[PDB]
Amino acid sequence: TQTTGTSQTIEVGLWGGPGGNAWDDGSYTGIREINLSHGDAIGAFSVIYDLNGQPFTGPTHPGNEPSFKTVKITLDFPNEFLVSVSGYTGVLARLATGKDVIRSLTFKTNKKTYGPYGKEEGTPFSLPIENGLIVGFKGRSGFVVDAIGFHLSL
Amino acid sequence: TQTTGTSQTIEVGLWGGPGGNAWDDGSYTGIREINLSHGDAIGAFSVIYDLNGQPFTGPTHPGNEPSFKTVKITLDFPNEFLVSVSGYTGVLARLATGKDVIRSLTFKTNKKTYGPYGKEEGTPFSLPIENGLIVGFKGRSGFVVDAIGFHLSL
Amino acid sequence: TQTTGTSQTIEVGLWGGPGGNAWDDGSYTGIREINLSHGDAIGAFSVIYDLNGQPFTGPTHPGNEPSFKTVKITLDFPNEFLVSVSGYTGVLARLATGKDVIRSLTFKTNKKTYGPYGKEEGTPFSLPIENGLIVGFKGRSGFVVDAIGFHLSL
Amino acid sequence: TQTTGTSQTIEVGLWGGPGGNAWDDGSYTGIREINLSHGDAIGAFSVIYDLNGQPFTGPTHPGNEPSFKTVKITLDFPNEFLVSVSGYTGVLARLATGKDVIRSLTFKTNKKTYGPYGKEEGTPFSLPIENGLIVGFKGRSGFVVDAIGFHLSL
Ligand SMILES: OC[C@H]1O[C@H](O)[C@@H](O)[C@@H](O)[C@@H]1O
Ligand SMILES: OC[C@H]1O[C@H](O)[C@@H](O)[C@@H](O)[C@@H]1O
Ligand SMILES: OC[C@H]1O[C@H](O)[C@@H](O)[C@@H](O)[C@@H]1O
Structure with a gap:
């Protein structure tokens, strides 16, 4: 209902x-x-x-970290699309929080792989997609990206 | 895949x-x-x-009927939403095509009913919804609305 | 959530x-x-x-109408599937209820049309589908089919 | 279409x-x-x-492991459902294959946590869910579970 x-x-x-x-x-x-x-x-x-x-x-x-390297990923939409998103979550000492943040991210499409970006340190995570598409992003940010999530659809 | x-x-x-x-x-x-x-x-x-x-x-x-009366249906979004759309499809004498057009339309939400608009003549049709929402409209138009359809989603 | x-x-x-x-x-x-x-x-x-x-x-x-003509519609699954279901609703005098029931039904797949079954009298209704599939039926039945509805999915 | x-x-x-x-x-x-x-x-x-x-x-x-302890997780369906499935993937020396298998699995419902089961060694993986449900499992098996995947739906 x-x-x-x-x-x-x-x-x-x-x-x-x-x-x-x-x-x-x-x-x-x-x-x-x-x-x-x-x-x-x-x-x-x-x-x-x-x-x-x-x-x-x-x-x-x-976020509020002005010293990072900026990167632009332009996908050949609609023929190219993500089939996997992975990365690393872990504590970043200089934040003085002791809580995990997104240390690294890797984007894999049906055409190529973008990344790894950041530092691959901490606990890895990965979301391989067999059917469906990421149609939106969500997460948490402070000084940097604290967490990330995805909206999926057929 | x-x-x-x-x-x-x-x-x-x-x-x-x-x-x-x-x-x-x-x-x-x-x-x-x-x-x-x-x-x-x-x-x-x-x-x-x-x-x-x-x-x-x-x-x-x-469309192209400068004589028609305009109507504005402002829904109390997101609390108010369509639970049904119905109307009539039939020929219009002045068109002399023998083909159907949308003669009437009625919009029923979980709060109230808007319409009927137009003339309830021809063959009625209706799309009562029990679960899900209309998230997009599609159709055909010339001088008037010839046909109408809906995109649905949970 | x-x-x-x-x-x-x-x-x-x-x-x-x-x-x-x-x-x-x-x-x-x-x-x-x-x-x-x-x-x-x-x-x-x-x-x-x-x-x-x-x-x-x-x-x-x-249901409970033993005199009715029985029909079996065997679809060439999965290549053949419904693209539309239509019919008629209305009161059937002999039931002595004064309430609408499903007087007729027509099933149209991408291959052919099955029906019309029953009597095409009363108010017509139709559910043409452009994208997605009927993956389940629901309704109301007594001696006959009082009402019908469908579950849809991509 | x-x-x-x-x-x-x-x-x-x-x-x-x-x-x-x-x-x-x-x-x-x-x-x-x-x-x-x-x-x-x-x-x-x-x-x-x-x-x-x-x-x-x-x-x-x-699979085929006579020494493994068996677990039966009976969920209080439908009130109880998974909100996360996680575990570890990695090589299991004795199999002599040199290929990753599912070393461990943890099931978290909205009521409690089941596991960890197996051995938490290798590379972790996790599927936290904020909206939707796991409605089917898929994977690969030999003597043990080599891989696992999920079907999701609203
Ligand atoms: O974004 C990383 C980190 O940045 C700041 O230190 C604060 O906003 C923290 O709450 C946050 O976790
Ligand atoms: O099915 C038609 C009719 O059959 C019986 O008379 C009862 O079950 C009614 O409620 C129902 O409407
Ligand atoms: O399941 C673990 C392992 O079991 C057997 O050795 C074979 O079926 C392998 O292919 C498989 O990887």
């Missing part, structure tokens, strides 16, 4: 720690571009989604 | 005739407002969708 | 009256065969669903 | 190695009971799924 007016999607995650502040881009129809920054961890994470055949810039999550 | 980068939704319809030009707004996360015009049939039809908590103006489908 | 252990599917309908007793076959992987009976209305209705590549006999809804 | 009569679900995984023989239980509407055996790895793995309110015995994947 329907009890709310907002549609929903399957959501997996989050991988990472409880620090930072929660954010959720919601869901769209695909992924066109990913902009992130990295160093000893993943700092910024912002996405340009596809919305019914046209680009749609999602809310930004730059 | 995934073979495309564009996600999908269930699609039902179309109800109505083969006339006019086909249109499809695509899919979103909900419905915020519906703007239509009616006389001896449904003329204009445009929707303001919800996209992850923010309104998104969908493509317009004004 | 998940709150129950039972998965769900989009559900449309019901079309028909409030008489008889409610039933819901639930959802499966597809439809292999439909067995029904018809005369001046639709009497018995039971389905052989597909459950992950193997047939699964669904709950029976025999 | 629909082009096949077989419905589908999102599928994630597999986690583990390439050894053993592939299997896929397919999808259902829930999980009632999980049966497995464990020692220095996960040996047997079977499930009693829910299929529209009734139990459905899933295909068996006993």
Whole structure:
């Protein structure tokens, strides 16, 4: 029985720690571009989604670490799409929190692999996808990316 | 196995005739407002969708009947949502095509009923929903709304 | 946020009256065969669903009209599937209920059309499908099929 | 547009190695009971799924480990359901294959945590779920569980 007016999607995650502040881009129809920054961890994470055949810039999550290396991943949408997302979660000493954050991220599409970005240290995690698509990102950010999760759809 | 980068939704319809030009707004996360015009049939039809908590103006489908009366259905989103859409499909004498067009439309939410709009003549049709939501509209339009269909999602 | 252990599917309908007793076959992987009976209305209705590549006999809804013509619709699963279900709802005088029942049903697959079964009198209804599949039937039955609805899935 | 009569679900995984023989239980509407055996790895793995309110015995994947202790996880379905499945993948010396297998598994429902089962050695993996349900299991098995994956649905 329907009890709310907002549609929903399957959501997996989050991988990472409880620090930072929660954010959720919601869901769209695909992924066109990913902009992130990295160093000893993943700092910024912002996405340009596809919305019914046209680009749609999602809310930004730059974090507050200005010294990281910036990276732009432009996917050959719609022929190229993610088939796997993996990374590492662990404590970053200079944060003085003792709580896990996203240390590294790797993006694998049906065409190639982007990454690893950041530092592969801590506990690894991976989300291989056999059927379906990531149609949205969610997570937690403070100084850097604390945690990440994904909205999935057929 | 995934073979495309564009996600999908269930699609039902179309109800109505083969006339006019086909249109499809695509899919979103909900419905915020519906703007239509009616006389001896449904003329204009445009929707303001919800996209992850923010309104998104969908493509317009004004048709071409300057004499029709305009109507604005502003839903109390997300608390209020459609639980049924019904209407009538039939020929319009002045079109002299022998083909059906959307003569009438009635929108029923969990809070109230809007309509009927237009003229309830021809063959009735209806889409009562028990679980899930309409997250997008599609159809065909010329001078009036020739046909209509819906994208559905949980 | 998940709150129950039972998965769900989009559900449309019901079309028909409030008489008889409610039933819901639930959802499966597809439809292999439909067995029904018809005369001046639709009497018995039971389905052989597909459950992950193997047939699964669904709950029976025999009704109580022994005089009806019995029909078996064996689909060439999985290449053949329903793209539309339509019919008529209305009062059947002899039932002495004054409530609408399923007077007629027509099943259209991508290969051919089965029916019309029963009597095409009353109010028509139709569910044409552009994307997705009927993966389960639900409704209400007494001596005949009082109402019917469908579970949809990609 | 629909082009096949077989419905589908999102599928994630597999986690583990390439050894053993592939299997896929397919999808259902829930999980009632999980049966497995464990020692220095996960040996047997079977499930009693829910299929529209009734139990459905899933295909068996006993592997072949006489010394492994057997566990029967009977969930308080439908109120109790998995919110996370995690474990470890890695080589098991005695198998003499040099390929990764499922060394350990932990099941976390909204009520309690079951496990860890087996030995937490090798590379960890985890599937936390925020929205949706695991409605089917798939993987590869030989003497033990070589790999595992999941079918997800709302
Ligand atoms: O983002 C990493 C870290 O940044 C700051 O130290 C704070 O916002 C923490 O709460 C957060 O965990
Ligand atoms: O099925 C038609 C009719 O059969 C019986 O008379 C009863 O079960 C009614 O409630 C039902 O409407
Ligand atoms: O299951 C572990 C192992 O068992 C046997 O040795 C074979 O079936 C292998 O292919 C498999 O990897």
